[PDB]
Design a protein around this ligand. Sequence first.
Ligand SMILES: *[C@@H]1O[C@H](CO)[C@@H](O[C@@H]2O[C@H](CO)[C@@H](O)[C@H](O)[C@H]2NC(C)=O)[C@H](O)[C@H]1NC(C)=O
Ligand SMILES: *[C@@H]1O[C@H](CO)[C@@H](O[C@@H]2O[C@H](CO)[C@@H](O)[C@H](O)[C@H]2NC(C)=O)[C@H](O)[C@H]1NC(C)=O
Ligand SMILES: *[C@@H]1O[C@H](CO)[C@@H](O)[C@H](O)[C@H]1NC(C)=O
Ligand SMILES: *[C@@H]1O[C@H](CO)[C@@H](O)[C@H](O)[C@H]1NC(C)=O
Lengths: 505, 504
Amino acid sequence: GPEDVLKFVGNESVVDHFKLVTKDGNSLLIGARNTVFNLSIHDLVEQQRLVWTSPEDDTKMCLVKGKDEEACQNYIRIMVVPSPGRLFVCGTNSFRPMCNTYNYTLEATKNGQAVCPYDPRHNSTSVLADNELYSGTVADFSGSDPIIYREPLQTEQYDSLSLNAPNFVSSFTQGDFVYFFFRETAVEFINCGKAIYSRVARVCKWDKGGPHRFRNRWTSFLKSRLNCSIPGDYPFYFNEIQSASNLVEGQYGSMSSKLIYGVFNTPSNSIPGSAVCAFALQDIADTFEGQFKEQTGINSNWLPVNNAKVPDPRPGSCHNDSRALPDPTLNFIKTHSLMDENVPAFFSQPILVRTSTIYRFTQIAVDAQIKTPGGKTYDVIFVGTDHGKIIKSVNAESADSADKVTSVVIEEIDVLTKSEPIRNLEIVRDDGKLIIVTDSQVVAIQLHRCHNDKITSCSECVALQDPYCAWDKIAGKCRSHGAPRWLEENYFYQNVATGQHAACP
Amino acid sequence: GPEDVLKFVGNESVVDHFKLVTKDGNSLLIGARNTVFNLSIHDLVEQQRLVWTSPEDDTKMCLVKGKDEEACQNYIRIMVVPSPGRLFVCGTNSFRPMCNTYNYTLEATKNGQAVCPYDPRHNSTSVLADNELYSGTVADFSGSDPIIYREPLQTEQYDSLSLNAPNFVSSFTQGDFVYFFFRETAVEFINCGKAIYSRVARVCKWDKGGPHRFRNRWTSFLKSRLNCSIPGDYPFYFNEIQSASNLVEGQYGSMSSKLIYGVFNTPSNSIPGSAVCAFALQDIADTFEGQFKEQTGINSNWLPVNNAKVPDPRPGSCHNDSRALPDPTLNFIKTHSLMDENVPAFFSQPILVRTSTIYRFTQIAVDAQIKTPGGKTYDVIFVGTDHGKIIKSVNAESADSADKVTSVVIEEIDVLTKSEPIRNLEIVRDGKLIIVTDSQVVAIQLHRCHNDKITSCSECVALQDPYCAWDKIAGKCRSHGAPRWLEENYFYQNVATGQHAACP
Ligand SMILES: *[C@@H]1O[C@H](CO)[C@@H](O[C@@H]2O[C@H](CO)[C@@H](O)[C@H](O)[C@H]2NC(C)=O)[C@H](O)[C@H]1NC(C)=O
Ligand SMILES: *[C@@H]1O[C@H](CO)[C@@H](O[C@@H]2O[C@H](CO)[C@@H](O)[C@H](O)[C@H]2NC(C)=O)[C@H](O)[C@H]1NC(C)=O
Ligand SMILES: *[C@@H]1O[C@H](CO)[C@@H](O)[C@H](O)[C@H]1NC(C)=O
Ligand SMILES: *[C@@H]1O[C@H](CO)[C@@H](O)[C@H](O)[C@H]1NC(C)=O
């Protein structure tokens, strides 16, 4: 396959999953089980190492004979950089999650309940704000009560209408609003059957509490389904979600191209077919302004909610005083938290689909829109699989009656061992490279293979349709973008679905 | 692939689909569009041909500008042999289905409403009885009213609770009870979403009608869902059904192995994964004896039906007098026709599954249980695909904590052109196979123990085919049903019996 530009076999069984990239500090804090590493983004050289050995009393309490000797240790899952500049790492610590703030300077330690999972399963995510941290994970030992913990607010205890077996995969903040991505079991569909529908949620930044003992509960909690289907005469849906990328902004704000890419796939019972579905923050806000989904009982009968029922205060909005908000809508928000309509997919079709293959998508990574010689900018997608095979892709919009979108599969070359599954991905923003955080090791390879790829044929650059690729006449080098600088404006031919028959022959 | 033992390219565009096998008469009546053929089973030689040219007045009424010049003609779909020996064929006749009772001797011609489909779509099936004919097809021109017509009873006009967009794929009779196989849209799940669940139905032999305006309607109509899923921690279902084989009986009646093999697959929107699920008449009768599925309204609320609601007369049973049956159960049968529980799959697992491949299962054929040298008898499965690839398979029962059946895929060799899809299969009782397709029908041997020569002993031993057997002094690979042994001999076979090696 591809030559290993940088390989890093740090640990045998620690199975790193978490990572933080700070380009100004120029250091990569890769989270890990029972260990922490600080490397340089240039050559993957560890600067310092924080090793946290779970106390003896904590490990001695965990004696489940099933599957604990290799596991049930310190799984450092969440980490952010607070405003004072402190170090904030929290581990599971053998089902005893307690956050320890930090260098080995222990500034303070606080209980890590509802911010670090008890199980080592990938079912939690976190994101920071200016003053508070947003984390969604389970609360009890078994994990039956999964809540969102912003200090010190909690949702309704054992509320299935809000959360029922979710797997938080993403979380980001935009304009005093923190969004969450998870796959929970829909209570309304349980009447029909057992299935999981990807539902996005959002909460305001400053929710102080609620009046009349509602101080613990949330007031503006809302959620709505994500519709990731292959449109046509009959819709074919994708139930489960595995990952979701960060928000994408293009050029000025006048453009409405705010795009969020999420990795979706088919449930366990069904075939390993996976699909990359895009969702916009504008498409998300369309359903939240819409009405809520109806919820009736066994005896009482109710019709889909109408506009007469909505109160004067609008649900899901940042107010200056949340406690002064009236109660009739606070008794109303719990029953009608879920929305009626699902968020439509971008351009009414998924971005990338892979059905016949055995492997399933597991992670995702998005690169910035580079300036292609065609005078346009499109988004780049990097999606990993449990097989370990990485797929590079870019998208051009094609006009058709069914809005057929061409899924450009640049190269499907596998980089790591077939056995190990990719569990986290990241792109570096100095030299072009890629981060593939897996259980066995993390390997850094170049982002685009326009350079270092030579089949001794001119056609290689032209046939791939890669945005970074470009060919020169007097020189035999296949040009790239971001690494070389042109002395003056030149001619570069590219075929990003532009309709070019041939060039090299 | 395999050499064409018998070739038969009868027609380029007639697209034959129907066939009737009579072993005593030794003739194969293969039904066809605008033609019908009566052949010999030995060498596929047509004895006589009846050509039925749709009348001019009938064809002139059919002027569908989309795609009719090639279609909208005489599609002979149903045919049985009545007791007098007459010929009873009915064709679509350009959306004018009129049955022709019979050689060209036309004894009588009667309207074929509710027994022959108007459309050329494969959505109807038929089966004969001692005195009446059982047929399930649409009634109107568009096809919105599909009913089951045994002369002269009809279901409720435009009844969605009983039938909603069905595709009748099979129909057979057993003990004064005629069962039907079709894939209709479930009204209760339509509330949740658009999906098709395979539902089997049955009707008694002698239902004259019902009193107090129920004379038109059926009294003993019942149906229940078919569960064709891959069991485990989470069930994965197969929604649509494409075909279903005839009943299988093994040795004496004391054994409970009466099984019907049906071909199932995944809806159109989802992936082409198909599954062959077996269902027993004993498993069918378990759900019909069970309670009925509840059906409530928008305002009224109802709980799942209980045993207190069932009347003293048992629904779905042959009575001596159907008119004397009370009315409170006749007003009850329509609302609660569907059963609550679905028919479980045989051994709680499908027989054969094909998911990763692009081709979909289209038909099915079951061979009789031959006597293998291992002292046992198992069923043989032949399932065709839209790709044209034919797969022969047999299944042996394996004991484990988790029910897992090994699906023996004997040979997956393609016989016909990749383009054409198989649309009907049948086995002959010399060992051969009949592959009725749109382009042509090809007759090839049933088992490939003979006519297969890789010059290696290991080929034969590895196949695990029941008909295959090897000899020591002679290099011939023995078969069953064609050669006769002079005396008892030794034959080694490994139908999942646990044999490491033999030839090397
Ligand atoms: C990771 O290691 C780097 C490399 O030492 C740290 O960055 C330096 O830290 C020292 C000590 O605080 C400072 O004096 C330097 O100014 C930092 N920058 C450079 C370029 O040396 C970094 O603080 C460590 N931690 C993280 C989270 O990045
Ligand atoms: C197909 O043709 C055969 C012709 O043999 C029919 O079988 C009988 O054949 C004998 C001798 O040829 C005739 O005297 C009989 O009249 C035939 N039977 C009948 C019922 O007429 C056979 O019936 C034809 N049809 C099928 C479905 O096999
Ligand atoms: C989900 O999206 C598809 C494609 O646009 C659409 O056909 C389907 O109706 C949507 N789902 C619902 C519940 O509306
Ligand atoms: C279908 O049958 C399987 C076993 O054959 C069982 O596990 C599953 O629960 C059944 N489900 C339905 C809906 O019939």
